[PDB]
Design a protein around this ligand. Structure first.
Ligand SMILES: C/C=C(\C)[C@H]1C=C[C@H]2C[C@@H](C)C[C@@H](C)[C@@H]2[C@H]1/C(O)=C1\C(=O)N[C@@H](C[C@](C)(O)C(=O)O)C1=O
Length: 378
């Protein structure tokens, strides 16, 4: 069994060391810093779920973050209920272990455990990526499980370029789209609250995988996470805008599906003020929305949502445009000291409208966005 076990107080490398390479056509779920963790690296395993009607949403990111040592191991959890309740906590643990069962380190049954030597948070992913299980055992905070049943959407990167969300930085989706179940109990500051999404309620989610050998905050001014479903469309986005020292490089790893077929493999992020028909490659344009309905974000950008315009370089030259409008404020935290330069990290449940450009299509759905703002820097 391949084992990456990070524990104690000597798990950090002395210098930034390289991580292992991208494995083509793989979830890449086994850690890229297997034995020692680079002090500037971050590895992320993300699992989420939301109700098909936006009545509930849940996301957890399992982190190994070298830069925030000693507290490098963390399951960051966010939960939202349609009645307005939100719940956000980190489970900071001293042990993070990931194992992959089988001879092939890129295609084995993976189990991750963020745990004390009481807090247990664990994930389990089938070797064929068909299913996941996430289990929380954190008495007095969160207990229960999340599961994914993959819908089998094409998703895996076939090359280093397809795994990138920016040069040398990786974010992609080992499971693009899954039927999600949730059966969780949260302790609200002693009161308990349930979140239950059964296997036939149309709740959906995915599994995202990321790793970076550099601290990403020093490289970006903007990060946008999206997962949304509207009618036949499923869309997932990780878009980065760099710092001004790289001239606001616009990068993305995104995908649009229609009835489970990938219709935009969007590894190109377009200038937000374009709305043209050029398409030499599949692409997505992310544009902050300020007009119309939607809760206004609180920090640097007072946006009511985001427009996502996907383009296909396929022969039909289709474009799809969706408006993702802030429906429920999920989380909101500063990413800098307050004031005129202040920035933030905001999560929303979004209402989704739109469809194929040039058609009568007008679909309706729900999703989540994570909208991160970072300082422009000296
Ligand atoms: C929901 C997903 C995101 C908000 C990601 C957004 C952009 C990513 C950039 C990428 C390169 C690294 C990765 C770690 C970031 C990810 C990130 O910033 C996360 C994430 O995965 N979970 C949250 C955790 C959160 C809200 O900050 C918290 O609960 O404290 C969070 O802020």
């Amino acid at each position: 069994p391949f084992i990456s076990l990070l524990q104690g107080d000597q798990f950090l490398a002395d210098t930034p060391i390289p991580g292992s390479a991208v494995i083509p056509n793989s979830g890449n779920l086994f850690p890229k810093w297997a034995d020692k963790l680079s002090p500037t690296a971050v590895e992320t395993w993300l699992f989420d779920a939301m109700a098909e009607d936006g009545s509930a949403a849940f996301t957890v990111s399992f982190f190994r973050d070298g830069s925030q040592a000693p507290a490098s191991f963390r399951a960051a959890i966010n939960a939202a209920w349609s009645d307005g309740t939100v719940w956000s906590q980190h489970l900071v643990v001293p042990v993070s272990v990931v194992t992959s069962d089988g001879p092939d380190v890129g295609h084995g049954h993976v189990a991750g455990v963020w745990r004390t030597e009481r807090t247990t948070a664990s994930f389990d992913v089938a070797a064929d990526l068909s299913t996941t299980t996430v289990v929380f055992d954190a008495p007095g905070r969160i207990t229960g499980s999340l599961t994914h049943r993959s819908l089998g959407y094409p998703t895996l990167p076939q090359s280093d370029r397809e795994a990138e969300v920016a040069p040398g930085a990786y974010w992609f989706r080992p499971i693009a789209m899954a039927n999600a179940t949730v059966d969780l109990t949260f302790h609200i500051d002693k009161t308990e609250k349930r979140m239950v999404l059964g296997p036939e309620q149309g709740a959906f989610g995915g599994m995202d995988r990321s790793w970076l050998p550099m601290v990403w905050g020093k490289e970006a001014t903007d990060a946008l996470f999206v997962r949304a479903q509207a009618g036949p469309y499923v869309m997932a986005v990780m878009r980065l805008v760099s710092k001004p020292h790289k001239y606001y490089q616009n990068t993305v790893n995104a995908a649009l599906y229609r009835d489970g077929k990938i219709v935009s493999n969007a590894l190109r992020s377009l200038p937000p003020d374009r709305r043209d028909t050029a398409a030499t490659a599949d692409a997505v344009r992310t544009e902050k929305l300020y007009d119309g309905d939607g809760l206004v974000a609180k920090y640097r950008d007072k946006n009511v949502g985001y427009r996502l315009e996907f383009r296909s370089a396929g022969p039909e030259r289709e474009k799809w445009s969706f408006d993702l409008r802030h429906h429920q404020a999920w989380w909101a935290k500063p990413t800098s000291r307050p004031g005129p330069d202040g920035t933030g990290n905001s999560g929303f449940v979004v209402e989704v409208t739109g469809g194929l450009v040039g058609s009568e299509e007008s679909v309706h759905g729900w999703g989540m966005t994570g909208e991160v703002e970072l300082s422009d820097g000296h």
